Design a protein around this ligand. Structure first.
Ligand SMILES: [Fe+3]
Length: 145
DNA sequence: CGCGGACGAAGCCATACCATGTGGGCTGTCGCCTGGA
């Protein structure tokens, strides 16, 4: 791995998220074939050369599984889009309370995505307490992004 | 009218097949008669 240095400190949450990372990679390469796939160029010995090679071949193509697995505006919108670009300095939360069916969605992904750029993470996630809303806005809201 | 005895009102509950070794305690026998010590 290149003999990394020791980190002077760590905290719980960091260890939790990176634990999700490690278990993710484990389950990742874990899948069956794989296994059978590369089950042809087995290492003959354990010297640094052969292990460097095998590790280097996984580095050659791991993204295979990655992509193979799939991984007139209203007043409110004008006021948030108007003044909010000054307040968007970093991580926080925006609680929006708009009338039913008025279009709170537009301001939701507008500000949500501007702030996503402010924090630097493209993907998002919406939790809805129904079932048909997922299957409807899944497409309704996908072809514009 | 004054009252005995009996019940009921709840707070409670609880994703990376296999094994056993142990012991010991109770019973009475003759050939009889003469001779010598
Ligand atoms: Fe593993």
């Amino acid at each position: 791995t290149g003999r990394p240095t020791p980190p002077d400190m760590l905290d719980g949450p960091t260890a939790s998220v990176v634990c999700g990372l490690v278990i993710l990679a484990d389950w990742l390469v874990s899948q069956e074939d794989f296994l059978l796939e590369r089950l042809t160029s087995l290492p003959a010995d354990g010297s640094a050369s052969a292990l460097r090679a095998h590790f280097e071949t996984s580095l050659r193509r791991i993204p295979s599984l990655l992509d193979a697995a799939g991984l007139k505006p209203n007043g409110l919108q004008a006021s948030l889009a108007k003044h909010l670009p000054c307040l968007c300095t970093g991580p926080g939360l925006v609680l929006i309370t708009a009338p039913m069916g008025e279009g709170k969605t537009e301001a939701a992904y507008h500000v949500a995505d501007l702030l996503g750029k402010a924090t630097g993470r493209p993907g998002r996630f919406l939790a809805l307490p129904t079932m048909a809303t997922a299957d409807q806005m899944h497409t309704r809201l996908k072809e514009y992004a």
